[PDB]
């Protein structure tokens, strides 16, 4: 039993090891998949097929560097998948021919939420897979050790942040009243955020948002948003610094402000667009 590398490198009977270099997909997004199909670079053959049958398994499968911190995956061995890193030796596949047939091993790697920018450095050891060989003729047990090296960087683009918020706020606090608006942002990967409000306005200072309603437009008032006592006019980007794994609260309060001189009974409802600007 012997195996050779697509590049031509071989490991004779008895086993040994070899490097298997791979060019992985340059970019992979979170939730997406990185597949390293080795059934394209590792071939083995049976030496005395006419009288001897060969049993090949995936003895072990280990992760290294990037793959080990930025990914979670499975090892699909001949139409079946198992955890990777591996925790148990897989079923055996048979080799019964002197013709080099593939070794059906493929990695399915998925970048995690926290995956950096370069989840895999170019030239780094990605994995080490051990191919086990036995036969129905004697008691030989040899191990073929494949070392998977990544030829290029595998980049996992940084995603947008998440704006957690409690739905439609009840500015009920009877006309004079004023509630605080829960709103935080958490970025999987730290980055600088910036936001601004947009909406129809009703004042020269552009900070009191008009009342949009169906039942008795309590004419006279409007909704003004403040962040820790500071007014936020429309289209006035507020630097939020850099949001990270800890959701920053924008610290907003819906306040009633007056527009014209004649506050009047009725309902006061408003619609404001909050736009987060990415760097």
């Amino acid at each position: 039993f012997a195996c050779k590398t697509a590049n031509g490198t071989a490991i004779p009977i008895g086993g040994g090891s070899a490097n298997v270099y791979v060019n992985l997909a340059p970019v992979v997004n979170v939730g997406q998949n990185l597949v390293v199909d080795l059934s394209t670079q590792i071939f083995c053959h049976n030496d005395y097929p006419e009288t001897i049958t060969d049993y090949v398994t995936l003895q072990r499968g280990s992760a290294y560097g990037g793959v080990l911190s930025n990914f979670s995956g499975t090892v699909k061995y001949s139409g079946s998948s198992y955890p990777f890193p591996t925790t148990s030796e897989t079923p055996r596949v048979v080799y019964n021919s002197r013709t080099d047939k593939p070794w059906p091993v493929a990695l399915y790697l998925t970048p995690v939420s926290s995956a950096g920018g370069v989840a895999i450095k170019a030239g780094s050891l990605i994995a080490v897979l051990i191919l086990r060989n036995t036969n129905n003729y004697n008691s030989d047990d040899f191990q073929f050790v494949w070392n998977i090296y990544a030829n290029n960087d595998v980049v996992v683009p940084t995603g947008g942040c998440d704006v957690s918020a409690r739905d439609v706020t009840v500015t009920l606090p009877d006309y004079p009243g004023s509630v605080p608006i829960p709103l935080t942002v958490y970025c999987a990967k730290s980055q600088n955020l910036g936001y601004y409000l947009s909406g129809t306005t009703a004042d020269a200072g552009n900070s009191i948002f008009t009342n949009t309603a169906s039942f008795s437009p309590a004419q006279g008032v409007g909704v003004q948003l403040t962040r820790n006592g500071t007014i936020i006019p429309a289209n006035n980007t507020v630097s939020l610094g850099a949001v990270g794994t800890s959701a920053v609260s924008l610290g907003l309060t819906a306040n009633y402000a007056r527009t014209g001189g004649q506050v009047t009974a009725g309902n006061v409802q408003s619609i404001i667009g909050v736009t987060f600007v990415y760097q």
Binding site: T158, G160, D162, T169, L172, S214, F215, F276, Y278
Partner: protein, 205 residues
Amino acid sequence: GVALGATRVIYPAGQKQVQLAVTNNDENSTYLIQSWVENADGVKDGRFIVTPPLFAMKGKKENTLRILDATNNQLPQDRESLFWMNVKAIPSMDKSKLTENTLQLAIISRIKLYYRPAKLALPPDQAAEKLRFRRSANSLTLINPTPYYLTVTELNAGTRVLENALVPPMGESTVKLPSDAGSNITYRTINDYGALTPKMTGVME
């Protein structure tokens, strides 16, 4: 809420289309996803059109946005053009809180979109270095001679820190210079994947 898969987008001149991922985290709450592309001056012209123009994401979903080139090579081919893509998530109205005073918010993600002319000399990964400078007891004029938009950040006059900058292709961008400077420039840029590039030392021109 709802978040975009990228923090920016690069539109390759020629590309029939470019995809962007959108996903709703709220286990239960529908949204109306409206998306459009403003230009550098923030004017909703037509240069780029996104599909679907309007749709709903009932709870956790993960659809795809398609940015479509609309400017039949009517744009600068020797450098990038800055555009702004906006994805607004519209929450449905709560038929219960009718006689109530309410304030419904609507989150919108606004990410840069660069139009990259298919043929450019200086390769993108080799541009954050061409960044030269020019100081004063006031100004520290950045100057990007490349055809890409440099998103300069963590820019320090060594001593004092400074104001981030977006230095347009083959153009400059001034930044205040608060005495504490000396000459030890230290900046980092944001790359095509929204990832920081390695520190670098300012090379005056």
